[PDB]
RNA sequence: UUUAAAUCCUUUAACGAGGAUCCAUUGGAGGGCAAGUCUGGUGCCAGCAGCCGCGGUAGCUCCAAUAGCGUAUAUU
């Protein structure tokens, strides 16, 4: 019955939820995390190997 | 009798052809008149139609074969106007009925059997 | 709502010859008119700048819902001798008298006297339609008035379809002809199933040395129809 | 293929493969001394195992 | 794709069932002295021809 | 419109030995619930020219449905013939009886 | 709420069963009105017929 | 109560106890004198046609198209079904407690006993045929009518005649005995307690339709009297 | 018992074929429809087995008759077709047509299917005098004539339900 | 009404539904996440997993059976 622990876990579906840039440094920009770096990593990786 | 009613039923073949129209009109499968019968023909949701022979001038009625010959409807006569106006549940004579297209109807088997009947006048 | 008279429309050739689309909002099926300005059961007709186009029912031909079904051959094309069996009061017979043209010919075979007036009036305002009020059942009662045709259409609607047709055969069609055979299934055997009469009909079409190459189902416009095309008496190859 | 109104009555193993490859159509074998069908809903008197 | 299929259903199929026999259903249908026909029959409880 | 309860007699039949007339009760109520014994015997005693005190019913079953109702009935010559022949259940439920206990 | 009644459940999946089935299959009407074109496309292109060999 | 037309009332002979039936297939039972509601009884397959009753707990039925003529015995709780002639029945009278007459569309006409399950008498176009050649049929009998405790029955149509018939020897034969002229519809048919005298009731048309309207006919009510000499 | 589960758990054929049954007749799960095969399985083993004996053998005959005549009578057959191969050529619709659940709906009495169940559960369907309310009962020949709207019913003419009253007290 | 008395069955008066929350389960297979923790590498990766985070304490989807549905051992 391993899927029926699974499924009494997952009961609740409240996600962790996401903090935003304090306000006194609101005037810089977003707050950016994992998912925004990644687009600004791969973009620079693919420029330089085609360089 | 004139020639133009050629199917004519016998009197074994008439006992069942009302009793199925009286059955029809309780399902609420059957359109009665001459103009109501012509229009399930162009819409083709007859099975068949029952005309009466002893409207005074027969050729009131004459345009419903020409039809059914091109839908293949099978298609009779009785010899009874009256007869014809009781079975339908109605206080007037009726020279000319149809019966719909029902999906679904009980009535498919007692249909089944009458159409092939009625092939068998024509042989 | 539908195609409203008084449209902007085109009409562009089929794949089939002597066959035509009709392009606009909704798409219909049209036949050249071989004599402008009448309808013969009312259909909405179209005029091209001389020239008209006839709309051509589904509903009410048994020909038309085949080609809008995607049947691959119907062999009826200008220039042709076609047989037609069971003409009834010409629906049909009407637009297959479009496709052949001024030089093909229609036979139009119907037995009963009442359907028959109606031919004869069709008959007089089209050339190539020759009215045979005869029983399709003994093709030897009406050889005289046929010659060899290159395709029979075939919607008698009879339990003895099969033969009907191959004695018909036999006599009028030449060989490498077409045929082209609408079937009832309630008509042949209403206590059998509809997919079994399809088989049995057409063992009994190889029992007759013809060869049937092609079968379809008709069910957006008819239940338990299906047409069949085959060939006669084949050349080899 | 065509007609789909048959019942296919066989007991080689690589015709039978052949056949379970084309939707609804019932294949009849030789299982123990009875017959047996496969591909069938209304198998009513067939051999309960 | 057929009319006559449900899905994986097979609705024209009926109590009358055609049957086609494979060369070596005849010779296993002997050796475990099976008739022919009346074995079909108990199996679908119908005709079978 | 108005509703009423009918009575109806049958296998009515006259008991000599034990000095009564007996028979079957149908009664009619199409609406309402089971009658009451009393009323029943108000109106039979009125169907048969009688005071209610000599008449005697038990056994009415209601049929499945609340259409009719079936029981019996006996009617005494006298009261002394009543109180003398009937089981003593029957007259405690007149209460002309009283059931005594008794010690062990 | 779907899976409290078995019948209303059942009575759910039919309706669905009928509208896949849409894609497949075509579904049988009558001429309750005048023929008034396709209302789609004629393809003319496609040969939908079965070969018999 | 009823759901339909009533096409039948009758009272039991020598009581306020009323008998109702209608197009709704079923069969009630009214108190008069008690303005109240007794029962309903089913078992009919159509439209019932009329309903006659007499001194005892009981009444019979017309089943109309449905072909049988019907005996309910109320306080046993039992039905009694009696196929008889083809066609509808609608007219019933009864002669006596053990005898009843019918009549049909079909022109014939019946005699019951309600301990045989068939007629006991069946006399075919009991009012003629009409008709066109090729399209002969029989005319439609309205109403029929019986003396209490004696053979005489009368039987009315659009035949411009109301014919008047005995009943042989053990109710096993009709005979027609004269033709009384009178032209219409005779849509009702009563014969007197002494049963010196015929009232007929007369009209244009059938009672319940407008299938025929016969001009020369008057809504009229016909006193018909009935003269003896041994 | 009155039912068995099926040899084969997994069959698309036979999940579709019971998925048309239900969609079709409106019936709760796959039970009501395996007691009703269960059934007719028994019907056509017994007609089999009585069709393997000799024309002439008095216990054919009698057996034949008897069934014959249940089947006739419970409406399934035809007059006509008194014979052991239309036995044989019964499918399982033709048992389901006979509930008083699929009568109800086609005599026009309720609008759907599953009206017509809610409408027989909740007392508003009778059969002759006596009032029904099983959805699976069997309706015979005689007494297919006999279904109606019960007489207490508010649609059968009698007193009007519990929401028309209080809403009628209300204004 | 029933019965020695009473219960039960059958009649029957009055209340009793919008998220109709007056809320069906058991088994199988998937999706979604942070300034969170651990482990190993191939910079920004992967596995495992995640009611635990800086501060704060006043009810996602699909499948099978359905008042029923699984697991373990032996077995045919
Ligand atoms: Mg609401």
């Known amino acids: 019955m391993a899927a029926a622990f699974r499924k009494a876990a997952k009961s609740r579906q409240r996600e962790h939820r996401e903090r935003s840039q304090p306000g006194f440094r609101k005037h810089l920009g977003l707050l950016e995390k994992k998912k925004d770096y990644k687009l600004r990593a791969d973009d620079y990786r693919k420029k330089q190997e085609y360089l | ?123 | 709502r539908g195609n409203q008279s008084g449209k902007n429309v085109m009409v562009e050739p089929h794949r089939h010859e002597g066959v035509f689309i009709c392009r606009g909002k909704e798409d219909a099926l049209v036949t050249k008119n071989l004599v402008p300005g009448e309808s013969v059961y009312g259909e909405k007709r179209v005029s091209i700048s001389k020239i008209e186009y006839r709309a051509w029912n589904p509903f009410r031909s048994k020909l038309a819902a085949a080609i809008l079904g995607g049947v691959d051959q119907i062999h009826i094309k200008p220039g042709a001798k076609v047989l037609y069996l069971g003409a009834a009061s010409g629906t049909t017979v009407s637009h297959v008298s479009d496709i052949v043209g001024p030089d093909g010919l229609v036979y139009a075979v119907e037995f009963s006297h009442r359907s028959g007036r109606d031919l004869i009036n069709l008959a007089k305002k089209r050339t190539n339609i020759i009215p045979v009020i005869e029983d399709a059942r003994h093709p030897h009662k009406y050889r005289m008035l046929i010659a060899m045709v290159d395709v029979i259409f075939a919607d008698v609607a009879q339990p003895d379809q099969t033969r009907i047709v191959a004695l018909n055969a036999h006599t009028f069609l030449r060989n490498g002809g077409h045929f082209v055979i609408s079937i009832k299934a309630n008509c042949i055997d209403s206590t059998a199933s509809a997919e079994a009469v399809f088989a049995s009909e057409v063992k009994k079409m190889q029992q007759e040395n013809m060869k049937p190459q092609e079968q379809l189902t008709l069910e957006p416009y008819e239940r338990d129809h299906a047409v069949v095309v085959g060939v006669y008496r084949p050349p080899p190859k | 293929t065509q007609h789909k109104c048959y019942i296919v009555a066989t007991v080689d193993r690589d015709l039978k493969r052949r056949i379970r490859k084309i939707p609804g159509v019932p294949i009849m074998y030789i299982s123990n001394h009875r017959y047996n069908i496969e591909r069938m809903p209304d198998d009513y008197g067939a051999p309960r195992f | 794709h057929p009319s006559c299929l449900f899905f994986q259903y097979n609705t024209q199929l009926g109590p009358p069932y055609h049957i086609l026999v494979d060369t070596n259903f005849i010779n296993f249908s002997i050796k475990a002295k099976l008739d022919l026909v009346q074995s079909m029959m108990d199996c679908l409880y119908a005709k079978c021809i | 419109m108005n509703d009423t309860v009918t009575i109806r007699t049958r296998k009515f039949m006259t008991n000599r030995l034990l000095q009564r007339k007996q028979m079957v009760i149908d009664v009619l109520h199409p609406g309402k619930a089971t009658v009451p014994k009393t009323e029943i015997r108000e109106k039979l005693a009125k169907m048969y020219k009688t005071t209610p005190d000599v008449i005697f019913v038990f056994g009415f079953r209601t049929h499945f449905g609340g259409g009719k109702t079936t029981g019996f009935g006996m009617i005494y010559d006298s009261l002394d013939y009543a109180k003398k022949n009937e089981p003593k259940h029957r007259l405690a439920r007149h209460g002309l009886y009283e059931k005594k206990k008794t010690s062990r | 709420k779907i899976d409290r009644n078995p019948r209303v459940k059942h009575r759910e999946k039919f309706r669905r069963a009928k509208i896949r089935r849409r894609g497949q299959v075509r579904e049988v009407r009558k001429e309750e009105q005048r023929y008034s074109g396709e209302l789609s496309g004629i393809r003319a292109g496609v040969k939908k017929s079965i070969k018999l060999k | 109560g009823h759901r339909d037309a009533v096409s039948g009332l009758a009272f039991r002979r020598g009581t306020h106890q009323l008998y109702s039936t209608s197009h709704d297939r079923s069969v009630k039972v009214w108190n008069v004198a008690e303005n109240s509601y007794v029962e309903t009884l089913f078992g009919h397959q159509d439209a019932v046609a009329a309903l006659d009753a007499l001194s005892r707990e009981c009444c019979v039925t017309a089943g109309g198209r449905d072909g049988t003529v019907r005996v309910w015995k109320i306080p046993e709780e039992s039905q009694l079904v009696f196929y008889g002639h083809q066609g509808s029945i609608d007219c019933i009278h009864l002669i006596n407690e053990e005898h009843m007459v019918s009549g049909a569309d079909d022109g014939s006409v019946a005699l019951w006993g309600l301990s045989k399950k068939r007629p006991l008498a069946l006399q075919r176009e009991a009012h003629g045929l009409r008709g066109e050649p090729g399209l002969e049929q029989p005319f439609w009998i309205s109403s029929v009518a019986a003396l209490l405790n004696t053979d005489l029955v009368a039987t009315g149509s659009h035949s411009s005649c109301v014919r008047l018939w005995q009943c042989g020897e053990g109710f096993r034969q009709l005979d027609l005995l004269c033709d009384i002229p009178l032209v219409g519809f005779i849509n009702s048919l009563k014969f007197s307690s002494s049963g010196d005298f015929l009232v007929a009731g007369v009209g244009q048309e059938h009672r319940l339709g407008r299938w025929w309207r016969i001009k020369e006919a008057r809504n009229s009510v016909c006193i018909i009297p009935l003269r003896r000499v041994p | 018992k009155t039912y068995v589960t099926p040899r084969r758990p997994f069959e698309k054929s036979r999940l579709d074929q019971e998925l048309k049954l239900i969609g079709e007749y409106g019936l709760r799960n796959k039970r009501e429809v395996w007691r009703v095969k269960f059934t007719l399985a028994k019907i056509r083993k017994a007609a089999r087995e009585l069709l393997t004996l000799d024309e002439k053998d008095p216990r054919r005959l009698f057996e034949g008759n008897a069934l014959l005549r249940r089947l006739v009578r419970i409406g399934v057959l035809d007059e006509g077709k008194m014979k052991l191969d239309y036995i044989l050529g019964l499918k399982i619709e033709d048992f389901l047509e006979r509930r008083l659940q699929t009568q109800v709906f086609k005599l026009g009495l309720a609008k759907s299917i599953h009206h017509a169940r809610v409408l027989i559960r909740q007392r508003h369907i009778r059969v002759r005098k006596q009032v029904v309310n099983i959805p699976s009962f069997i309706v015979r020949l005689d007494s297919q004539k006999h279904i109606d709207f019960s007489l207490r019913s508010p649609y059968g003419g009698g007193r009007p339900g519990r929401v028309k009253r209080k809403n009628a007290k209300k204004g």
């Open chain 2, 1 to 123: 009798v004139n020639p133009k009613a050629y199917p004519l039923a016998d009197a074994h073949l008439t006992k069942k052809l009302l009793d199925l129209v009286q059955q029809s009109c309780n399902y609420k499968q059957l359109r009665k008149g001459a103009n109501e019968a012509t229009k399930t023909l162009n819409r083709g949701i007859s099975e068949f139609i029952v005309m009466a022979a002893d409207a005074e001038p027969l050729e009131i009625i004459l345009h419903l074969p020409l039809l059914c010959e091109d839908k293949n409807v099978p298609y009779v006569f009785v010899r009874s106007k009256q007869a014809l106006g009781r079975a339908c549940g109605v206080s007037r004579p009726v020279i000319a009925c149809s019966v719909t297209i029902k999906e679904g109807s009980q009535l498919k088997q007692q249909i089944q059997s009458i159409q092939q009947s009625i092939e068998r006048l024509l042989v």
